Design an enzyme around this catalytic site. Structure first.
Site, PDB file in Angstrom:
ATOM      1  N   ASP A 115       1.200  -1.128   0.155  1.00 33.47           N
ATOM      2  CA  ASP A 115      -0.077  -0.022   0.114  1.00 33.47           C
ATOM      3  C   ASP A 115       0.988   1.329   0.070  1.00 33.47           C
ATOM      4  O   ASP A 115       2.033   1.145  -0.750  1.00 33.47           O
ATOM      5  CB  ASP A 115      -0.992  -0.095   1.124  1.00 33.47           C
ATOM      6  N   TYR A 143      -2.883  11.168   0.300  1.00 36.40           N
ATOM      7  CA  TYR A 143      -3.982  11.026  -0.487  1.00 36.40           C
ATOM      8  C   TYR A 143      -3.862  12.091  -1.376  1.00 36.40           C
ATOM      9  O   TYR A 143      -3.945  12.256  -2.343  1.00 36.40           O
ATOM     10  CB  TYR A 143      -5.339  10.512  -0.112  1.00 36.40           C
ATOM     11  N   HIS A 173      -6.197  -7.580   1.209  1.00 35.31           N
ATOM     12  CA  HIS A 173      -5.452  -6.375   0.911  1.00 35.31           C
ATOM     13  C   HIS A 173      -4.009  -6.709   2.021  1.00 35.31           C
ATOM     14  O   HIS A 173      -2.997  -5.765   1.748  1.00 35.31           O
ATOM     15  CB  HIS A 173      -6.077  -5.044   0.958  1.00 35.31           C
TER      16      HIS A 173
END
EC number: 3.3.2.10
Lengths: 295, 294
Positions: B107, B214, B275
């Site tokens: 990630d 982000y 994930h």
């Protein structure tokens, strides 16, 4: 007086229509009526600024769409309340009011509904005014050129998480709806006089779910369009005016370029001072465009 | 539980560049392996592997800048991306006196490990990824229905996300439970640590700090989606990729883009994981790590 004041002589009905009940506000009388169709996140009161300006010139009819305002909600989440459902609801409403034809004003969801009304019940629609006019041709433009940052809500609002989180309290409801009313406007204080009326509306049992039902109903169609497989359709024949908010960050004004592909007879103009809510942000100019097109 | 405190676990606050990082460590000698967590995580996502590997490696598990117990900024930022995390890790390796290390990421950690391997290649001996997103994913972020999975990347960039998710413990729990369950194939894998996870994201600044990633990565993401990513040099270090087959956000099919970005990559899949390979399938993840770094 306020753009969100209510003139005397505004009338409210709960009308039985198809297998539902719609709240309909009406003001004015005489001449071919004008049917005004709201979007998300809205309800009939979005039309108060234009009703204040025009009620002595037109008979204005402003329904709450199924699953919005004081219209009936379904008990559970639904995926079958799309543009064709709203169109068929509007055709039945005009039939309930004894009206053979109307002018139609649309934006956002109301623009999808207006297009489907014009194709599916062509005789009921005299002419069309759109304050933005999304078409099937938008396609990959929903997710390219930075637009993916604007569309997050369309996916989020399909989740159980959205109703749980936004529905936590009046405060969470106020945070969420303030974001859309501010970020989608160029005039950021446009909704300030009715902000608490919007929050009262989205605290009504079912009004989160009922509005989120639109995003569930359009999802399969939007995904197909994004992958370049748009829904084929016939051009709209009725005389059309498009008056697009130039600063609209969600329905980009550049998408006006797709209107001629879907309309035989559309005149296109821009409101230079508005974002997504031309009829609230620039009501004097919006009232003048309506009065001119519907004269 | 897989989240018990392993023997040898030490905690430090270490000054690196213009910040202070919380660094969890096990051992000081033998093979050093730097572990880089993702969002929505912090150093404790490594507790399952640490419980399996504590007698075999020098494990270094920082909280990245703006996560866990590392320093946060007072206001929202957009300059804390892969390159900033990479340069922080380069300075942390200098503070620990480590000339070169194995690196593990997924990630956020995967992007940071790529940026460290490129920007300070002398410091990285080899790389293990538990998912390995590249600039080549491109339009696959938003096509074939994938737009419905990435909403959170754009939502988390708004002031609305911090104000809404941060309303109460109940709003925080509801939000973070969504990601831990929806992104997992083994749906209960975080339950023993759930209360500690919410404690972490209730710490002042930990919403905003994680949301900064982000904001910081958005321009690169938008360039990739339109098929115009900045070209980069291939990563030359030996690489291992062990991707969760059921990962719904980083699709395992995006393993197809690894060979374009890596000279030497050994690619396999964890059949029972989404994930969070290192949490959902920790026995298998520890076996892949021990073999690749041993």
């Amino acid at each position: 007086s306020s753009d969100f004041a209510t003139p005397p002589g505004l009338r409210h009905r709960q009308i039985a229509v198809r297998d539902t009940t719609l709240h309909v506000a009406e003001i004015g009388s005489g001449g071919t009526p004008v049917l005004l169709l709201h979007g998300w996140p809205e309800f009939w009161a979005t039309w108060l600024p234009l009703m204040n300006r025009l009620h002595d010139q037109f008979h204005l009819i402003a329904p709450d769409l199924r699953g919005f305002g004081d219209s009936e909600k379904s008990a559970v989440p639904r995926s079958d309340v799309g543009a064709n459902s709203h169109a068929d609801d509007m055709a039945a409403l005009l039939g309930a009011l004894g009206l053979e034809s109307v002018g139609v004003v649309g934006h956002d969801v109301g623009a999808y509904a207006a297009q489907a009304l014009a194709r599916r019940h062509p005789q009921l629609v005299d002419r069309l005014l759109f304050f933005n006019c999304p078409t099937a041709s938008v396609g990959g433009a929903w997710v390219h050129h930075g637009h993916v940052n604007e569309v997050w809500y369309q996916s989020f609002q399909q989740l159980g998480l959205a109703e749980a989180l936004v529905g936590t309290s009046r405060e969470t409801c106020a945070l969420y709806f303030r974001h859309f009313l501010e970020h989608w406007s160029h005039r950021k204080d446009a909704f300030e006089p009715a902000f608490e009326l919007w929050i009262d509306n989205f605290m009504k049992p079912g009004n989160l779910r009922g509005g989120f039902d639109w995003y569930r109903s359009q999802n399969a169609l939007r995904l197909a369009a994004i992958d370049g497989h748009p829904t084929p359709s016939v051009r709209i024949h009725q005389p059309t005016r498009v008056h697009w908010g130039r600063h609209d960050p969600i329905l980009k004004s550049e998408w006006s370029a797709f209107v001629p592909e879907h309309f035989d007879d559309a005149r296109i103009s821009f409101c230079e001072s508005a974002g997504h809510f031309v009829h609230v942000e620039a009501p004097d100019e919006a009232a003048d465009v309506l009065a001119e097109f519907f004269g």
